[PDB]
């Protein structure tokens, strides 16, 4: 579950 | 010569980060995808909100248009892609098969195929007509950050945090080429040039590179911006002067002269990372979109 809602909106 | 992009409209409506914006090939629309699970459609010329398209159970990382501007495909954290009839806003097909977040997507020019890349480290090729997955390519050893078809749909380029750009034969599924400089920074974006002869690749060391595909060598390098963390879209702008356009993690849109590699404009206005930029197919219009602290899309227009 990505905190910011979408994978592209996260750091990897 | 330098472009004179200036802010014309700010498109507000999304309630979380905007992940990707794309202009329809007919120039009439902009589609935006968001962490808020929604796709929104906006007038390309007036910025006017047209409609909300909903259905995904989780946030969306990418959206792309069919060549006839009638369909959109979206890539979601819910592990699916959805094909959407834009006019009705209805979900025509849910493309299921990926085992982790779907990160990137694109139609081929003929638009009978969709290519997708995922956190599951694979690239998939889907039949638009039937919704069936034609090929699963074991493309990379880390999440796949971008996927794009060339001019005639005969090739797919993919990139990954694994540091590789790879080029695939659409028909056979064969890996035809692996591109890498003398180092392995994560590759955060890749796409073919409009003539299919080059590949523009972003890496997470603040650098964009123009590669000659056939010769397999880096020709040009664009620097000065900030890109260390996010998979930011970049573009060939061709409707006026020949530019490279990218977002940046310092909240600016950067524009470089393709030939000279000099920065020619920095568009200020966003208040968070500019994750996505898109160039209008016929007019000098740039759409930009930002992450969660911003939530807006901006349309910028220029005389060249």
């Amino acid at each position: 579950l990505n905190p910011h809602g979408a994978a592209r909106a996260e750091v990897y | 010569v330098k472009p004179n992009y200036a802010l014309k409209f700010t498109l507000a409506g999304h309630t979380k980060a905007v992940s990707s914006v794309k202009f329809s090939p007919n120039g009439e629309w902009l589609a935006s995808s968001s962490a808020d699970k929604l796709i929104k459609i906006w007038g390309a010329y007036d910025g006017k909100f047209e409609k909300t398209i909903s259905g995904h159970k989780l946030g969306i990382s990418d959206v792309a248009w069919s060549s006839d501007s009638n369909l959109l495909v979206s890539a979601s954290d819910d592990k699916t892609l959805k094909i959407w009839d834009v006019s009705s806003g209805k979900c025509l097909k849910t493309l299921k098969g990926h085992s982790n977040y779907v990160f990137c997507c694109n139609f081929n020019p003929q638009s009978n195929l969709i290519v997708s890349g995922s956190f599951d480290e694979s690239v998939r090729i889907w039949d638009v007509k039937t919704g069936k997955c034609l090929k699963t390519l074991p493309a990379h050893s880390d999440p796949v950050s971008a996927v794009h078809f060339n001019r005639d749909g005969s090739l797919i380029v993919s990139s990954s945090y694994d540091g590789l750009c790879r080029i695939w034969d659409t028909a056979s599924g064969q890996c035809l080429k692996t591109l890498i400089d003398d180092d392995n920074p994560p590759v955060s974006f890749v796409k073919f040039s409009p003539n299919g002869k080059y590949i523009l690749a972003a890496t997470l060391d603040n650098t964009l590179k123009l590669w000659d595909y056939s010769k397999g060598k880096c020709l040009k390098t664009y620097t000065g911006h900030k890109n260390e963390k996010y998979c930011i879209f970049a573009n060939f702008s061709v409707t006026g002067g020949k530019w490279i356009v990218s977002g940046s993690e310092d909240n600016l849109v950067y524009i470089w002269n393709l030939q000279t590699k000099e920065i020619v404009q920095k568009l200020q206005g966003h208040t968070d990372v500019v994750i996505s930029t898109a160039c209008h197919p016929t007019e000098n219009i740039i759409a930009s979109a930002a992450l969660e602290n911003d939530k807006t899309i901006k349309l910028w227009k220029s005389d060249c």
Side-chain angles (χ1 to χ4, degrees), chain B residues 22-138:
Chain B
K22 303 283 182 66
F23 285 106
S24 65
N26 68 6
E28 293 175 17
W29 307 112
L30 184 77
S32 60
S33 57
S34 172
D36 69 10
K37 312 172 179 186
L38 306 175
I39 294 166
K40 283 171 182 293
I41 308 293
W42 316 77
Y45 305 104
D46 55 0
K48 196 181 59 178
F49 176 74
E50 186 63 25
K51 81 177 75 184
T52 297
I53 295 177
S54 62
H56 275 295
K57 304 164 65 166
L58 292 172
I60 303 166
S61 290
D62 202 5
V63 65
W65 291 89
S66 66
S67 284
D68 67 6
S69 314
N70 294 325
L71 305 178
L72 284 170
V73 59
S74 51
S76 170
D77 275 19
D78 66 16
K79 303 179 192 71
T80 73
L81 297 111
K82 286 176 178 287
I83 305 183
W84 302 96
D85 176 77
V86 178
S87 180
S88 75
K90 282 192 163 188
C91 176
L92 296 201
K93 295 189 170 67
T94 298
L95 306 180
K96 308 174 185 170
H98 278 299
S99 56
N100 209 338
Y101 317 128
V102 194
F103 198 86
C104 46
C105 54
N106 257 317
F107 284 87
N108 67 338
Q110 179 180 331
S111 288
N112 64 317
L113 296 179
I114 288 160
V115 61
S116 65
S118 170
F119 255 56
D120 69 18
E121 312 182 355
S122 71
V123 166
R124 280 172 150 87
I125 296 168
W126 310 83
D127 181 49
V128 173
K129 196 184 271 269
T130 63
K132 289 185 139 52
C133 180
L134 299 185
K135 297 186 171 55
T136 300
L137 318 177

